[PDB]
Assembly symmetry: C2
Homo-oligomer: 631 residues x 2
């Protein structure tokens, strides 16, 4: 079966991260059979050694000699560590000389939580492991590729990283989805710079070849239903969140339902628990357990709600089982049937087959900037990214009277000034809280908005790199937001994206600068979305970098990289929020365009008004339902 492969990649040197198992192991195996010398990098030494021994044995079977020279390993390699990536490249070049194929295959599942349960450092770790590592190894290996005249970079992405002009939501997986989309976007925007010498493509396989995860889903559902009901009740109830949570302390579903003084949101939730609950499960008669309570308390504390850390210290523990085996097995079959039901071909691909298709694809010298699907044929949700638009309804705009608006930004002073004035002057917002990065940014906005500052309608807060603490200041001092608009603090850098063939690339976008780019243009939005969703914001517009007719070709590339990658975040958290009955509406407003000629004197003011209308379209709330006694 290896006859088609032998010789296909003879004389190539390949580095495969995550090479000890899964798709990466099979790509390493089949590249070796096809004649390439391979360096397999992974964290676990023992698994790598077994893989290396298996491959070398198979090479000897089909006639290669000196097989120890053809398959090397790099154990203990954590691709999230920049120092270890340098060590890996040094080890590889010492073994084999120049690398022909960089197979960026390593990937961690990530935090596996909803955004509002996702620690910021956990999100960052996923980005370093799954996305920044890919840029870093390219940055270390592309100079030698370009010098020798040929090279190939393959980022092993995922179907759940989306496609060129559409985003794919991956609820409870926003960090993973963003890193996958970033892998594809890196190929899309770096191809023109890396050509003609170097090809760069992504592969995005679909599903490839349990009770514990199902129980977690049910525990998460209980958490979401409680959190949404408490957030909603605190919105329209005179009682504090502290007083509302005290209603849950008896941990008695029927008693809460029957409490005439409990808010309707909580009473109706208790009725649902009793009706939809399995009578053999204690979740049908108890509101929560200690694990759910602690996670709920963290959500509330992370949303700026004030309540004692020991409020659940005397919570009665429901007896096992909280969910029955029947409930858990039912959810597990639902998960499995959902995944199987995606497959047009009704059969799960193997890792071997996906690797074989990838190894054939690597022979194709005429593709760059593409995302190849070695398996696919999937019925799954899809959100085409952006377009023509208009203004929202007059009744939705009338809902902005008296609102509290947060605006976040620094560099886009003209946008921030106009947006503040539109909310305040056109739609009678009560106040605008302007959250900037630095004192210099604060003074700039205060001068641009001096009239509204002097009248108490424009407040400024300096966030620095502590945006969550700044939002807590806004919550405490000025009240929770309705609309929030989040723009990046920083402009895009202007450094080269590739080096000249005979240069040392010393001025090219560094590994650290790429990480800084992700921090200011992706993580910035995730932190705001996380905090604002937790803090009961009504709507949130995420704004991507601006490009103008004077932007450089590299800035256009990076803007489109950010636009594509952020659309995966926006799509995912949108579906997460909808499916969990959070009310917050999260949307993305793009300021950039792919080509320079598409940029706007008069067209400038027209472009700024279009931005204003797009933001109003996604931040103007719906009017409440009418009083049924009269209308």
């Amino acid at each position: 079966w290896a006859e088609s492969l032998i010789g296909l990649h003879l004389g190539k040197v390949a580095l495969i991260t995550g090479g000890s198992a899964g798709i990466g192991g099979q790509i390493g195996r089949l590249l070796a059979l096809s004649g390439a010398r391979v360096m397999l990098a992974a964290r676990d030494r023992h698994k790598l050694e077994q893989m290396q021994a298996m491959i070398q044995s198979e090479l000897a079977e089909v006639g290669y000699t000196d097989v120890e020279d053809r398959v090397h390993i790099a154990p203990g390699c954590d691709v999230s560590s920049e120092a270890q990536l340098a060590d890996l490249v040094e080890r590889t070049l010492s073994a084999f000389g120049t690398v022909d194929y960089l197979i960026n295959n390593a990937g961690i599942a990530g935090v596996e939580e909803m955004v509002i349960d996702m620690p910021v450092e956990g999100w960052r770790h996923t980005l370093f492991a799954n996305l920044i590592s890919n840029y870093s190894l390219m940055r270390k290996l592309a100079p030698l590729m370009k010098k020798q005249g040929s090279g190939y970079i393959l980022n092993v992405s995922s179907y759940f990283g989306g496609e060129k002009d559409a985003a794919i939501p991956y609820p409870n997986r926003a960090d993973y989805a963003v890193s996958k989309a970033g892998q594809r976007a890196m190929a899309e925007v770096f191809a023109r710079f890396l050509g003609p010498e170097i090809q760069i493509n992504a592969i995005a396989p679909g599903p490839v070849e349990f009770a514990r995860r199902a129980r977690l889903i049910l525990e998460n559902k209980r958490l979401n239903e409680l959190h949404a009901a408490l957030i909603a009740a605190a919105r329209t109830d005179e009682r504090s969140m502290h007083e509302l949570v005290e209603l849950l302390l008896p941990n008695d579903v029927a008693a809460l339902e029957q409490n005439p003084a409990a808010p309707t949101a909580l009473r109706e939730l208790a009725r649902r628990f009793r009706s939809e609950g399995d009578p053999a499960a204690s979740s049908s008669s108890a509101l929560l357990n200690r694990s759910i309570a602690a996670k709920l308390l963290a959500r509330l504390h992370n949303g700026g709600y004030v309540l004692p850390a020991d409020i659940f210290a005397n919570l009665p523990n429901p007896p096992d089982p909280f969910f029955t085996r029947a409930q858990i097995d039912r959810e597990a079959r639902k998960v499995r049937d959902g995944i199987m039901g995606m497959l047009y071909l009704q059969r799960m691909p193997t890792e071997f087959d996906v690797a074989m298709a990838t190894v054939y694809y690597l022979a194709d010298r005429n593709v760059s900037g593409e995302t190849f699907h070695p398996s696919g044929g999937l019925r799954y949700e899809r959100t085409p990214t952006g377009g023509l638009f208009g203004l929202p309804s007059p009744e939705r705009l009338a809902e902005l009277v008296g609102s509290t608006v947060y605006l976040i930004g620094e560099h886009l002073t003209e946008h921030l000034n106009l947006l503040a004035r539109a909310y305040l002057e056109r739609y009678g917002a009560r106040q605008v809280v302007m959250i900037v990065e630095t004192e210099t940014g604060a003074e700039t906005m205060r001068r641009l908005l001096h009239d509204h500052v002097e009248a108490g309608r424009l407040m400024t807060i300096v966030a620095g790199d502590q945006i969550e603490a700044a939002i807590d200041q806004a919550i405490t001092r000025y009240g929770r937001p309705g609309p929030v608009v989040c723009t990046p603090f920083r402009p895009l850098p202007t450094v080269p994206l590739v080096g000249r063939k005979d240069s040392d690339w010393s001025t090219v976008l560094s590994e650290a600068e790429f990480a800084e780019l992700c921090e200011h243009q992706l993580t910035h939005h995730f932190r705001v979305a996380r905090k604002i969703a937790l803090s009961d914001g009504a709507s949130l517009a995420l704004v991507t970098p601006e490009t103008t007719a004077t932007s450089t070709t590299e800035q256009f590339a990076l803007a489109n990289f950010i636009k594509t990658t952020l659309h995966a975040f926006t799509a995912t958290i949108g579906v997460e929020s909808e499916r969990t009955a959070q009310r917050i509406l999260i949307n993305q407003v793009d300021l950039t365009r792919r080509a320079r000629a598409e940029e706007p004197p008069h067209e400038r003011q027209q472009e700024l008004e279009r931005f204003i209308e797009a933001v109003l379209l996604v931040t103007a709330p719906l009017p409440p339902e009418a009083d049924t006694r009269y209308a």
Copy 2:
């Protein structure tokens, strides 16, 4: 070099249309080397025989025996003819038994004109040759594939057929672009029905490996500039189009520029010809030649303008050269440099290389509904298809007072009623001309709109299958349109899209019914767009079929097929119109959605209002420029 290939497809039977040359010939060649028995179909017998002889010789070289049994040909095969497709399938099954791989490769370039110069029968011929042929061969070969448990359909599409969620404009090639997009859309929507037994995918290669075409471009540019200026002048000049064309009869650029009584549009055009013209070319001193005049006369006659057929009979002939060799060679280099400048890899792929990548791809058993790019890495324009939107500006809506609106449809009576009322009652349109297919449709709309009928604001015309003649009736009797809205006359069919494994497929969507689908859901819109652009309509909304919660799964599939395929048309004619300085704004409004659960009692009226707003957004004209003496 064939070592990787031998055995890869051993025992497969493949039918390749367009198999005598180009990519199809190389796919046939490499499939044969890989062990498949191949039937090569093409029109020219001699070229096919040479290809067959070359392949058989190569098979004998690498060790196959009885090579005449491995490579057959089907000469004189015109895939645009349904009868010849039946003959081809009978010939193939007689030779080889069941076909494993259908390689739908045949394709003609098509009409190679702008939509407004494109004969309707020429458009239809391209659809039959390039798109309907693909369905017809699938319909004849899929039953045997499903019966034996395996099969593969590959539609050889093009990069200029777009991608899953974005359209790619191909000006002067709308018929080709639509057929290419339809090939991809057929794979996308039929995959779920054809699985698990049958895979269906498309390939969309980019450019693969002149003075005459450049001269045609320059002649077309002269045509476009004259036509746009005449159309514009007739709009605001008291003189008839007949009288305006008489100003061109001296065929003297300088005299027209200097004529104080000539409309400013024509005087400024003549100045441009003199300034931008090569003084050694007679196009700098003569307005047109007899070839351009005849094509211009056809445009005007096809737009309902009245002027004698012999109006250019005494036109002075400009001496050669009309365009200089320098001008022609300059345009030729511009065309070439444009295509080369697309390639990220700065090198043109060969037909052999694209075929090799396709033959490797055919081994992948885990992909269906995909579009594989065997070459790619292209910097080219892209229009992401659809989304959130709003209402247009109040000043744009005020421009609708006194307008003449055409509405075209029959089945969507509720949409047509509401749209007519919105234009008439909300925005003070002067009149609405309702163009339906049948008398029964006319009486239905007349009853729904009886108040506006009785008041002279709603006129009805019955078009049958002669929509162009019906529009001429509207032009003559009621005046030229501003906004036009074009909806399909017919609903989508409800027949099965595949048959049961042991059935004869007698109820499955027939080849004729697929052609009828294209006529009513694609050609219908092309004919209207062509006629309305020629007739100086100000805007045109193309509306795709409606789906509701009661639509069948097959109707959802066909609606998305039409939506994807029509977006290629809309994108192409949009860019064509913009690049040639036509003022007409053409956009697409989609009524369907991919999934059934995404369909709307109350949500129904909300969905209809959204449709109204989308149509107003693309049909409300811009206000004119203000009088500079005062503002």
